[PDB]
């Protein structure tokens, strides 16, 4: 196989998707073939599509998914509102397994935090990471409360021997300020900060996003991912 | 000894202080002697004082502080900014142990979430709960992300064998709405919801705060906390 990376986060809306796109772009620019799998998409009525965002910002074509729920809720509540079950655990695991190949960086996005229900019954992105032997990139804020949430998310990963690939700060404010700076220094002491995406980067055009993305990660750490 | 509860949260500003004041009020109204305890307090340059809010809202007089910092930051950062160290682990334990008394319920409020550093080095409210053999009451939101943060907090408690005494929704809107209704329903499938304090409980005067508090918790649960 190749390298599988779940991109989780301390919660909903911390920037997992733009981080997938940003790492996908950096990898592709280093000559690494990239796949992204978002098994369950929600909020489709209002037009949410995290896979399309990655395809537009990073140019990935291998973009796999299984389920789309109209309501902008967590997967399990959106499926309960729609009256239709989430996908099954095997379905997601096999989909990621079949995307995987040597020379390929395969990224996997769930929804919200590490423990939100992703399949029936009650199976999480952690269970998926364990099943496909993926390591975990953890996207965090630099804002109030981030150390507590980052530490809780790391404990849950380590509890099932899901390896921490590093942290990414999903949105790095400009100018930093005293809180963001202070918080970044402290996260830097509990795990490697692989990147800090500048605030608003999800709305750049693909040229700027690629340039921004290649400056955001360390060229050698990306190269060695596969 | 008596009963020691740590009152933690899924994060900062979820209402741990108002829950302390509310559980204190309800326990007092059951005739239970209450002490409340706040080892680390930040933001004194802004007038933040959680022990004082608990005293104001619930009439508690047995209020024990220890470390105080001017800046409203994480304790580590606030103490750094003030050129001080966090207290040691044994000083937080001494503060709590000195308060413990048979027939007494001693509430210990941390700062922010469960794994926030409260004592050098990297010592948390969970470590402190272990040292004093306290259960943990988890204050949560009914907002976006609560399930994940609550499940992560509950799992970290069980990982150190710290018993969980339940959830309190620190701020509960009237009327709930679809999001808060959905979350309270889901939180209650994973633990006991001991209370859901009506939003704005901190603006109730002494008399109404005590009525709210007596109705917010199940008296039989409150009374069964303390032998
Ligand atoms: N646990 C959850 N509870 C409620 N809504 C959620 C949850 N997880 C995802 N969502 C919905 O999915 C949208 C995108 O979330 P997510 O992809 O996790 O953000 P990001 O990719 O920026 O980290 C959110 O705006 C929200 O509408
Ligand atoms: N980890 C932290 N990071 C930043 N600020 C904190 C932290 N912990 C406590 N504070 C400060 O203490 C104040 C109240 O926090 P807390 O007592 O945890 O809230 P509540 O009692 O409402 O749950 C906040 O306004 C914040 O400034
Ligand atoms: Mg996303
Ligand atoms: Mg407080």
Short mmCIF file of C-alpha atoms in Angstrom, two decimals, chain A residues 9-12 73 77 81 113-116 126 144-145 148-149 151-153 155-156 159 178 182, chain B residues 9-12 73 77 113-117 124 126 144 148-149 151-153 155-156 159 178 182:
data_model
loop_
_atom_site.label_atom_id
_atom_site.label_comp_id
_atom_site.label_asym_id
_atom_site.label_seq_id
_atom_site.Cartn_x
_atom_site.Cartn_y
_atom_site.Cartn_z
CA UNK A 9 -9.65 18.13 14.21
CA UNK A 10 -10.45 19.47 17.62
CA UNK A 11 -14.03 20.07 16.40
CA UNK A 12 -16.36 21.30 13.66
CA UNK A 73 -25.86 18.69 10.84
CA UNK A 77 -28.41 13.66 13.09
CA UNK A 81 -33.63 13.64 9.98
CA UNK A 113 -14.15 16.11 15.94
CA UNK A 114 -12.48 12.73 16.23
CA UNK A 115 -15.47 11.09 17.95
CA UNK A 116 -18.50 12.21 15.94
CA UNK A 126 -10.80 6.73 15.04
CA UNK A 144 -9.29 30.12 23.35
CA UNK A 145 -9.53 26.54 24.59
CA UNK A 148 -7.48 21.43 26.27
CA UNK A 149 -9.15 20.19 23.07
CA UNK A 151 -4.74 17.35 24.44
CA UNK A 152 -8.05 15.47 24.68
CA UNK A 153 -7.88 14.61 20.97
CA UNK A 155 -5.14 11.22 24.25
CA UNK A 156 -7.98 9.57 22.34
CA UNK A 159 -5.45 5.34 23.41
CA UNK A 178 -1.06 37.82 22.11
CA UNK A 182 0.88 32.26 23.10
CA UNK B 9 -16.06 21.45 31.65
CA UNK B 10 -15.65 20.84 27.95
CA UNK B 11 -13.91 24.20 27.84
CA UNK B 12 -13.82 27.76 29.10
CA UNK B 73 -5.33 33.82 30.13
CA UNK B 77 0.23 31.94 30.51
CA UNK B 113 -11.25 22.30 30.44
CA UNK B 114 -10.20 19.06 32.13
CA UNK B 115 -6.64 18.99 30.78
CA UNK B 116 -5.86 22.65 31.42
CA UNK B 117 -2.58 22.86 33.34
CA UNK B 124 -4.40 18.99 35.71
CA UNK B 126 -7.87 15.13 36.61
CA UNK B 144 -22.41 22.64 18.16
CA UNK B 148 -17.48 15.29 20.67
CA UNK B 149 -16.00 17.47 23.42
CA UNK B 151 -17.24 12.23 24.81
CA UNK B 152 -13.54 13.18 24.77
CA UNK B 153 -13.77 14.61 28.29
CA UNK B 155 -13.14 9.16 27.99
CA UNK B 156 -10.18 11.01 29.53
CA UNK B 159 -8.75 6.60 31.43
CA UNK B 178 -33.80 22.38 17.30
CA UNK B 182 -31.16 17.64 19.63
#
